[PDB]
Paper text:
[name] ([name]) is an adaptor protein involved in cell signaling where it interacts with a number of tyrosine kinases via its src-homology2 ([name]) domain78. In this way it plays a role in integrin dependant cell migration via its interaction with focal adhesion kinase and subsequent phosphorylation in focal contacts, consistent with its homology to the C. Elegans protein Mig-10 that is involved in cellular migration. It has been shown that overexpression of [name] enhances cell migration, while inhibition of [name] lowers the migratory potential of cells and is therefore linked with metastatic spread of cancer cells. While co-overexpression of [name] and ErbB2 occurs due to the proximity of their two genes on the 17q12-21 amplicon, [name] plays a role independent of ErbB2 in cancer progression. These important roles of [name] in numerous cancers have established [name] as a therapeutic target. Following the conventional nomenclature for [name] domains, the [name]-[name] domain possesses a 3 stranded anti-parallel β-sheet consisting of the βB, βC and βD strands, flanked by 2 α-helices, αA and αB.
To determine whether the fully formed staple (rather than just the O-allylserine functionalities) is required for the high affinity binding to the [name]-[name] domain we synthesized the G7-B4NS peptide (for G7-Bicyclic 4 No Staple) which included the thioether linkage to achieve cyclisation but was not subjected to ring-closing metathesis to form a staple via O-allyl substituted serine residues. The dissociation constant determined for G7-B4NS binding to [name]-[name] was KD = 4.9 μM. To investigate the observation that the ring-closed G7-B4 peptide bound with 6 fold higher affinity than the G7-B4NS peptide that had not been subjected to ring-closing metathesis, we determined the structure of the [name]-[name]/G7-B4NS complex using X-ray crystallography, to 2.6 Å resolution. The asymmetric unit consists of four [name]-[name] domains (consisting of residues 429–527), two G7-B4NS peptides, 3 water molecules, and two phosphate anions. Additionally the Y5 of G7-B4NS forms analogous interactions to the Y5 of G7-B1 with the phosphate anion positioned in the pY binding pocket. Likewise, the G7-B4NS peptide residues 2–7 all form the same interactions with [name]-[name] as observed in the G7-B4 co-crystal structure. Electron density for the peptide, however, was not visible for the O-allylserine sidechains (and, in one molecule within the asymmetric unit, was not visible for the N-terminal two residues and, in the other molecule, not seen for the C-terminal cysteine). This absence of electron density suggests these groups are flexible and do not form an interaction with the surface of the [name]-[name] domain. There was also an absence of electron density for the thioether linker indicating that this linker is more flexible in this crystal form or in complex with [name]-[name] than the equivalent thioether linker observed in G7-B4.
Numbering used by the authors:
A (entry chain B): 422 to 486, 488 to 529
B (entry chain L): 3 to 9
C (entry chain A): 426 to 531
The structure:
């Protein structure tokens, strides 16, 4: 589903890149700190905002399709049915990330 | 022994 | 947590071979079972090119939370369901994607 993520603690909807950096900063700027949002500049997909080494990196997550919707951060090399699956997976696996997702940044 | 992932 | 159709519990490798064959022997046809040789973990029985291959799924524990892996801990999953849904989209170490659930007869 592409609607499951819209009531999660780590999902912040349409906020700016600047707003997400402030939120993560207020939360500590600790490694693994993360949130997911809709991109204001690219409303089609989502952004995983992650903190690593006191810096906030932003990773694009775009939806795509076999008539089945899926999300990906790497042009389809790694695919996910929902954003929740993508988040749960990178709590265990680094993937394209510099570190694991450790702490949810909340609203 | 008999696994495709060598376990 | 597993009441899923593709999970057949404690059945043999020979039984899984028959079940998969009986259901069509189509590529992507699969089931998950408990390992007879490794009672600790599970086996993904997968059909590819008219042959059935078996993939061992070993559990581990970190911080008191259970997780599973098919690649000696290199790729981990919170549950078998996550492992299955993930390999329906991603090849991973498998020769093909998980396409069809193998269920018991009705």
């Amino acid at each position: 589903s592409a609607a499951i993520h819209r009531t999660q603690l780590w999902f912040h909807g349409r906020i700016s890149r600047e707003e997400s950096q402030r939120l993560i900063g207020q939360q500590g700027l600790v490694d693994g700190l993360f949130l997911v949002r809709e991109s204001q500049r690219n409303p089609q997909g989502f952004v995983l905002s992650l903190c690593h080494l006191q810096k906030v990196k932003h990773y694009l997550i775009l939806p795509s399709e076999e008539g089945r919707l899926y999300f990906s951060m790497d042009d389809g090399q790694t695919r996910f049915t929902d954003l929740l699956q993508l988040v749960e997976f990178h709590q265990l696996n680094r993937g394209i990330l510099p570190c694991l997702l450790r702490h949810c940044c909340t609203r | 022994e008999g696994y495709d992932n060598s376990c």
